[PDB]
């Protein structure tokens, strides 16, 4: 199967890409909200049975100490994409400049992966869409969304999957360019609540942020150039503490 | 080794190359041309190992000629030379390096100035008023350093080469059977067939 599986249809559409976009559309909702001094990305831990254990499924992942990703679509396709993402972060970057890549660049690389899936012989596009949030010395904070086409674009706030439209709408009304992190968290939570069907608490939600540096999560004291990672995932407790303030 | 000298006056570049090819104990030929015209306004002279010498030259020629066709344009001497340096710089770290040294004299029709480039087998390139490879420099530089002037006419340079060729024939142990001289100027490349007596 060495020929492109994704071909151009007479109307000018890339069949497989739109279909992958459909798969994405059915996935659980996830959102990202970019504040001034941070970014938050959240999703819902759709437990497929209470027998499964919630924690053992990181829907939100650290790509570099300053970049996280959340998705909507087919989890497996995401899981392998995160692996490759963390990898390329090093190969095409930390091993050449001694520092992790900047969000847009990593994002750009990830995109490149997905595009290949859109054109290489014998494969199908990834059935996922990711919201990648991060920070870097020169570009500050950013949030990006990446599609199976490979297309990516930045946002001030957005949501994908199931309740995307409703959510985008709510976000569109609450977001403004003067938002402090806690607030966007708040909004993330609020926005989350409306797309969530059943119990809404610290064990069914997953919030992660990209903010100030956490020295306590470094693992060592001594070298002062790197003050720690910016990506921090929220604890069940921390999430609930905020929920209680609904 | 063979003698390869070049001197760029004000409106042109003159190159002189010994006319002798020695293989072991005998002199095989006393009328060799150790140069190839890269483009109608650039010439390259060369000296070094038996086969590598012509092979490299011809390869470079072909490739410059091809660029000329594909683009309907004549690369500047500067371009032509950066191209050569790279090819040499590539061969020093190959399986078997071309042991070749060259001089590239060209008239840059765009800037309206003459240009002489000296590149050794290692890919070391340098732009100079006059230059030579091997030992030729040793005998002549003192003369060149002394009598050279930027505003020299084609004729003044030809005489300086003459004086240089004289020193070589006086102090150098091997008989290089004389030199073939050529000038690269705005009107092209001509061979001063009068350097046996001028």
């Amino acid at each position: 199967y060495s020929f492109s599986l994704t071909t151009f249809s007479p109307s000018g559409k890339l069949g497989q890409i739109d279909y992958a976009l459909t798969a994405v559309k059915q996935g659980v909702t996830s959102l990202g909200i970019k504040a001034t001094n941070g970014v938050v990305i959240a999703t819902e831990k759709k437990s497929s049975s209470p027998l499964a254990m919630s924690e053992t499924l990181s829907k939100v992942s650290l790509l570099t100490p300053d970049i996280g990703a959340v998705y909507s679509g087919m989890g497996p396709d995401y899981r392998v994409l995160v692996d490759k993402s963390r990898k390329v972060a090093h190969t095409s970057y930390k091993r050449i400049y001694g520092e992790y890549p900047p969000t847009k660049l990593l994002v750009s690389e990830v995109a490149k992966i997905m595009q290949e899936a859109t054109q290489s012989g014998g494969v199908r596009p990834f059935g996922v869409s990711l919201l990648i949030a991060g920070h870097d010395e020169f570009n500050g904070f950013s949030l990006y969304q990446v599609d199976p086409s490979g297309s990516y674009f930045p946002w001030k706030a957005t949501a994908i999957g199931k309740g995307s439209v409703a959510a985008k709408t709510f976000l569109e009304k609450r977001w403004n360019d003067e938002l402090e992190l806690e607030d966007a968290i708040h909004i993330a939570l609020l926005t989350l609540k409306e797309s969530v069907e059943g119990e809404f608490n610290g064990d069914t939600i997953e919030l992660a942020i990209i903010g100030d540096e956490n020295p306590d999560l470094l693992g060592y004291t001594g070298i002062p150039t790197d003050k720690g990672p910016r990506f921090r995932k929220l604890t069940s407790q921390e999430i609930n503490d905020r929920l209680e303030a609904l | 080794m063979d003698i390869i000298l070049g001197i760029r006056v004000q409106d042109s570049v003159i190159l002189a190359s010994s006319k002798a090819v020695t293989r072991g104990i005998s002199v095989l030929k006393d009328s060799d041309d150790k140069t190839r015209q890269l483009s109608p306004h650039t010439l390259m002279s060369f000296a070094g190992e038996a086969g590598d010498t012509v092979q490299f030259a011809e390869y470079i020629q072909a490739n410059i000629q091809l660029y000329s066709i594909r683009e309907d344009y004549e690369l500047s001497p500067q371009a032509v030379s950066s191209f050569v340096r790279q090819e040499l710089a590539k061969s020093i770290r190959s399986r078997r390096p071309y042991q070749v040294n060259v001089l590239i004299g060209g008239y840059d029709k765009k800037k309206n100035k003459p240009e002489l480039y000296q590149i050794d087998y290692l890919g070391t390139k340098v732009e100079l008023p006059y230059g030579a490879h091997g030992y030729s420099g040793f005998y002549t530089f003192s003369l060149l350093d002394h009598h050279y002037r930027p505003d020299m006419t084609t004729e003044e340079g030809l005489d300086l080469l003459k004086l240089c060729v004289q020193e070589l024939e006086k102090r150098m142990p091997m008989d290089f059977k004389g030199v073939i001289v050529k000038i690269v100027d705005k009107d092209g490349i001509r061979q001063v067939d009068d350097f046996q007596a001028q």
Binding site: - | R23, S26, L28, K29, E49, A50, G51, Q55
Partner: protein, 212 residues
């Protein structure tokens, strides 16, 4: 070994000796040092016997292929650049050969190219190669004139070899002569040096120091 080829009015003269040695041991006095590439081209042998015999025989083939492809006699220049380029491909491997590719075509006229395992290809009017070169050059240089006649020229080459066969220990046996013309080459015999030295001495008066 001593081989010469020189260009002139009537064409090309190729003359070679026929001695092969393995140290001080004379392995053969009857070797053919002229590889008949094809009816129009001549190649000489010096350096490695195998290398020349082989690659020039092969050259003989490549030329044929060319003459089928283009329906035109391959030029010596082309003929020689093939061998030459081939030889340059193996440079460093240890090929040993130095040869003259001789031919007379309409387009080029009579032509002689010196090609060697170092990758040298040269066009010239006179060439001698082998341990006995300097001796043949000596004779050639002084009696060489373009206006020579086929008969004299044959002799000149024949003699130049004689010269070398006398002084050089590694050359001798007999001289083989070849005249290359535009209609092809013509063999002009194998002349045993033994018999030839006495005859030439007697007739010419040279080699006086030798008693006989």
């Amino acid at each position: 070994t001593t081989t010469l080829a020189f260009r002139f009015q009537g064409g090309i003269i190729v003359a070679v000796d026929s001695r092969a040695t393995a140290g001080n041991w004379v392995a053969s006095q009857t070797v053919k040092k002229v590889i008949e590439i094809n009816p129009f081209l001549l190649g000489t042998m010096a350096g490695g016997a195998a290398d020349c015999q082989f690659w020039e025989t092969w050259l003989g083939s490549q030329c044929r292929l060319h003459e089928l492809r283009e329906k035109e006699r391959i030029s010596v220049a082309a003929a020689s650049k093939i061998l030459s380029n081939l030889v340059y491909q193996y440079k460093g491997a240890g090929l040993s050969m130095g040869t003259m590719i001789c031919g007379y075509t309409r387009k080029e006229g009579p032509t002689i190219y010196y090609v060697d395992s170092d990758g040298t290809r040269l066009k010239g009017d006179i060439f001698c190669v082998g341990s006995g070169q300097t001796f043949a050059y000596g004779v050639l240089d002084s009696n060489y004139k373009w206006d020579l006649s086929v008969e004299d020229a044959l002799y000149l080459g024949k003699r130049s070899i004689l010269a070398a066969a006398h002084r050089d220990a590694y050359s001798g046996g007999s001289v083989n002569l070849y005249h290359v013309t535009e209609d092809g080459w013509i063999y002009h015999g194998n002349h045993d040096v033994g018999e030839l030295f006495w005859k030439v001495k007697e007739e010419e008066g040279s080699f006086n120091n030798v008693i006989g």
